[PDB]
Amino acid sequence: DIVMTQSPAIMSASLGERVTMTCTASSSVTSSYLHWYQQRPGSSPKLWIYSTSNLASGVPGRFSGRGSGTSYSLTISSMEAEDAATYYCHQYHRSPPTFGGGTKLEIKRADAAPTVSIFPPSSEQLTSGGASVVCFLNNFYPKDINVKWKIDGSERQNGVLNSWTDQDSKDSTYSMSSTLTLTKDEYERHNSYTCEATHKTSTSPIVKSFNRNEC
Amino acid sequence: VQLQQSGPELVKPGASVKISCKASVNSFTGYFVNWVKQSHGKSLEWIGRVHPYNGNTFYNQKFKGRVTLTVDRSSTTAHMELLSLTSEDSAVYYCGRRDDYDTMDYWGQGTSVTVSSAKTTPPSVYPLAPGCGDTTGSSVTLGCLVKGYFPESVTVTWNSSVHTFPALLQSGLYTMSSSVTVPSSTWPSQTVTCSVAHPASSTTVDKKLEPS
Amino acid sequence: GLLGNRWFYLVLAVLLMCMISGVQYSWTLYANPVKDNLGVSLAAVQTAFTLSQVIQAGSQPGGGYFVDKFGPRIPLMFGGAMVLAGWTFMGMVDSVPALYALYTLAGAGVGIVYGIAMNTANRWFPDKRGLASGFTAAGYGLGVLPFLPLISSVLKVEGVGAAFMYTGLIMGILIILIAFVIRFPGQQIVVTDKDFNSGEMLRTPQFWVLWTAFFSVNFGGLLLVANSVPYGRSLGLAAGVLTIGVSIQNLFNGGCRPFWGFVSDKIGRYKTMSVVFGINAVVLALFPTIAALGDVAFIAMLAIAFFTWGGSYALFPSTNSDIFGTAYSARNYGFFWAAKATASIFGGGLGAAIATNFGWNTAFLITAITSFIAFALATFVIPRMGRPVK
Ligand SMILES: O=C([O-])C(=O)[O-]
């Protein structure tokens, strides 16, 4: 078929900046047969630019589309919060149609210190026989973060599940849940649990911990 | 013009999957109906297209005879039926209207189809409170943790500052967490309940978070 | 009697052109759906159109030879036969080369049929050649307007193959019936001093200046005929707007021929050529800008461009008959049909590839430059070149 690569795959642009992304195809594509679709993280794909130049119904005019031959570009004059989505180019020069790899556009912002919160296993889950220690890191930029789970002053790896949130719609920050699920025997055999988060915002990592016999 | 699809589908491997796509009065006037799939929300690839009047079918070589597209002859709904389910068939399927230039003017919300040898499981919902270790703070943060469920679609409500974290697969189970950050004046001074709804098993649970 | 009347054969020629109009002018709208179902690039189907027009360069002089020597009846018989063969089986196509071959055969028939109709018009009206050529070319340009709904209704109601076979049968049978009646004004052949043969005409620089001017003029017109709908969509126009635009451009193109023929009768044909080519160059230069303004602006640009371009298909045959004699006129206009085919080379596949690799604006710039070249040749070069001496 015709392979289309979109560069860059993931990009971060400050609010109000000018954004340009490119969609390069293996062969030449006739400009009438290459389109762009914008997909919000939670929603379905939406038609954005059709035939490389023309905006679909209900599309702001700050969106520009150029390109001919093997290279095509979608340009935004002024970046806005509502513009943060994924963009897919779509070619139909020859059957079968193929889609690009997608360009993930994210909003840049000033760095913010995360809020770290620890949670001992709940009573109901303790009754069931399980024990999970949940750590919440909320409202931090950028997306990169380091988490180490300490049990009695020793690192733990088994059962550590790290989950990242997509960028927030309001303050363009991220969130993370670090879950350490262990058996009841392993929970009751140990005393103190420490959640440590190392971030670019602060040189000193943020430490939050609790002890079973301390209250 | 609007497009509505079927609900989420859980199917054991090797079975039949049937997806419907309802349209408006005359939405397929000079348009094909295009069926596309998205693997995990990162890649788009074309499945097929069918003419709402002639029945002419055009299919990708990836899905050679796996897929059958059929329009209902009232130009109101189109159906995608797939029959050779394997591991890579778990994805979200989109129906759209597609003019002569392969431009898809209008799409549907999508139908998430998952192949799973396992069976549907209800969720275990638990509360998350700080405890007596530390009470001071300008704001408090609380959570509801959903564990052990199947299939993936659950919705957690808090009775603005919520953070819902994506579900993860732990040894064949779905684990999910939600956190709400409220001012310290709100808790425990005012009632705050989390409502976890898992509609596949039709399980809605309200949990009230009290000091630990 | 009736069969001796001068205008009866003009009406027969216009009827013939009306019948064969669909073969060429139905492509403007159906090129995109044919590309869609065949699953190939636009350049492929445009190259099919290019082949259909190119084989006319080898066909029309061949039919003109027989028309000039032995008369137009047998040549029209076998031209209608070729059109019938090409169009009848056109419905049962599911491969690219099958479309290539069948459309080429249909074009080969259409070329000689057009040559015969135009030659009948020009020979029957020595005093008014511009008007007869304009009426015949108008029949060729407008016949698609009633024909397209009829085949379109059959396609929705009965299908593709039945529609193509039925329309091809009707067109071939009507052409054969008309071939029974048409005749030349004489009733042998006598060569006068003003009658130029093929080699004698090709010798003079006047013929090659005219050939180059016609080749340059046909660029934008044939590119528009091939790719107005894809270019229109690249401008961002709905299907209905593009269909209305195609109908309007066909109507203006068809209606321009009698008007420009009357002007060429009442004024020097070279000056009419110069005016028409200058206006065409101006429109083609401004086409990307005014066409980008909106739907009405785009359709108006299309209508004016087709007005100017189609004006030449009455200008050139009458010029050929006036300059290089009457007894040799059919095969003489065949060599101008050769220029039409050589320009259709760019009008179809080559122009499609140029648009694919450098955008539509590049191809439109090429057409504007060639139109300016033709304007320069017609306005300044040939009017002072005199008449051929042989
Ligand atoms: O369309 C044409 O080629 C004409 O004007 O005869």
Numbering used by the authors:
A (entry chain L): 1 to 215
B (entry chain H): 2 to 160, 166 to 218
C (entry chain A): 11 to 197, 203 to 405
Q: Would you copy out the relevant sentences from the publication that reported this structure?
A:
In the oxalate-bound state, the OxlT protein adopts an occluded conformation with an oxalate molecule binding at the centre of the structure. At the binding site in OxlT, oxalate binds to the transporter with one carboxyl group forming a bidentate salt bridge with Arg272 in TM8 while the other forms an ionic interaction with Lys355 in TM11. In addition to the salt-bridging with the oxalate, the ε-amino group in Lys355 forms an interdomain hydrogen bond network with the carboxamide groups in Gln34 (TM1) and Gln63 (TM2) in the N-terminal domain. Similarly, the guanidino group in Arg272 forms an interdomain hydrogen bond with the main chain carbonyl group in Ala147 (TM5) and further interacts with the side-chain carboxamide and main-chain carbonyl group of Asn268 upstream of TM8. The hydroxyl groups of Tyr35 and Tyr124 form hydrogen bonds with either of the carboxyl groups in oxalate. Furthermore, the aromatic side chain groups in Tyr150, Trp324, Tyr328 and Trp352 form face-to-face or edge-to-face π-π interactions with the carboxyl groups in oxalate, indicating the significance of the π-electron systems in oxalate for molecular recognition by OxlT. Since the oxalate molecule tightly fits to the binding pocket, replacing oxalate with a larger dicarboxylate, such as Krebs cycle intermediates, causes steric clashes with the residues in OxlT, likely destabilising the occluded conformation. From the oxalate binding site to the cytoplasm or periplasm, extensive intramolecular interactions were observed between TM helices in the N- and the C-terminal domains, such as TM2 and TM11, TM5 and TM8, the periplasmic halves of TM1 and TM7, and the cytoplasmic halves of TM4 and TM10. These interactions stabilise the closure of the interdomain cavities in the occluded structure. In the periplasmic side above the oxalate binding site, a hydrogen bond between Thr38 (side chain) in TM1 and Val240 (backbone) in TM7 (2.72 Å) closes the pore tunnel in the occluded conformation.
